[PDB]
Amino acid sequence: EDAGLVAEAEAVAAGWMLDFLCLSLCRAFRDGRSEDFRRTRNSAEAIIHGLSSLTACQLRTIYICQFLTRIAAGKTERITPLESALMIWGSIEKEHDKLHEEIQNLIKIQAIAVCMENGNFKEAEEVFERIFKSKLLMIISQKDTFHSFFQHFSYNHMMEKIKSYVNYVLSEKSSTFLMKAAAKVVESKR
Amino acid sequence: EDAGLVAEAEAVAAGWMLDFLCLSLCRAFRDGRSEDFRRTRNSAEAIIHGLSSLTACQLRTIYICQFLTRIAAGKTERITPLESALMIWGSIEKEHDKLHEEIQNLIKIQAIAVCMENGNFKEAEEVFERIFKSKLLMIISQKDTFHSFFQHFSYNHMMEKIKSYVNYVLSEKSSTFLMKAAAKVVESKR
Ligand SMILES: COc1cc(Br)ccc1CO
Ligand SMILES: COc1cc(Br)ccc1CO
Ligand SMILES: COc1cc(Br)ccc1CO
Ligand SMILES: COc1cc(Br)ccc1CO
Burial zone of A160 (CB within 10 Å; 0-12 exposed, 13-18 middle, 19+ buried) = exposed
Residues B10, A14 contacting (CB under 8 angstroms): no
Residues B84, B77 contacting (CB under 8 angstroms): yes
- Scan residues 141-180 of A and list those with Cβ closer than 8 Å to B: 177-179
Technique that determined the structure? X-ray
Of A29, A28, A25, A21, which is closest to residue B17 (Cα–Cα)?
A21
Q: Kindly report the number of other CB atoms within 10 A of residue A153's CB atom.
A: 20
* Separation between Cα atoms, residue B69 and residue B29, nearest integer Å: 9
Dihedral of alpha carbons B137, B138, B142, B145, sign: negative
Q: How far is B31 from chain A (nearest CA, A)?
A: 10
End-to-end CA distance of chain A: 39
* Separation between Cα atoms, residue B21 and residue B17, nearest integer Å: 6
Q: Where are the alpha helices (DSSP H) in A50-96?
A: 56-72, 81-91
B55: enclosing H helix or E strand: none
HSE toward the beta carbon, residue B153, CA cutoff 13 A: 19
Which residue in B3, B10, B40 is closest to A50 by CB distance?
B40
In the three-class reduction of DSSP (H, G, I as helix; E, B as strand; rest coil), residue B92 is classed as strand
Residues B82, B71 contacting (CB under 8 angstroms): yes
Residue A36: closest C-alpha in chain B: B50
Of how many residues is chain A composed?
190
- What's A143's DSSP letter? T
Of A75, A91, A100, which is closest to residue A162 (Cα–Cα)?
A100
Residues B116, B109 contacting (CB under 8 angstroms): no
Q: What is the DSSP string of B97-159?
A: HHHHHHHHHHHHHHHHHHHHHTT-HHHHHHHHHHH--HHHHHHHHTT-TT-HHHHHS-HHHHH
Residues B103, B158 contacting (CB under 8 angstroms): yes
- What's A51's DSSP letter? -
The domain B3-181 belongs to what CATH superfamily?
Telomere repeat-binding factor, dimerisation domain (1.25.40.210)
Of B9, B92, B14, B12, which is closest to residue B49 (Cα–Cα)?
B14
Ramachandran angles phi, psi of B93, nearest 5°:
50, 45
In the three-class reduction of DSSP (H, G, I as helix; E, B as strand; rest coil), residue B161 is classed as helix
Q: Looking at beta carbons, which residues of chain A come within 8 Å of B20? A: 13, 17
Give this entry's resolution in angstroms. 2.2
Taking CA atoms only, the protein residue closest to ligand 2 atom 4 is A45
Q: How far is A184 from chain B (nearest CA, A)?
A: 8
Residues A47, A21 contacting (CB under 8 angstroms): yes
CA of B72 to the centre of ligand 3 (A): 5
Q: Which residues contact A122 (CB under 8 A, 6 or more apart)?
A: none
Of A134, A171, A166, which is closest to residue A67 (Cα–Cα)?
A166
- Give the start-to-end residue ranges of the domains of chain B: 3-181
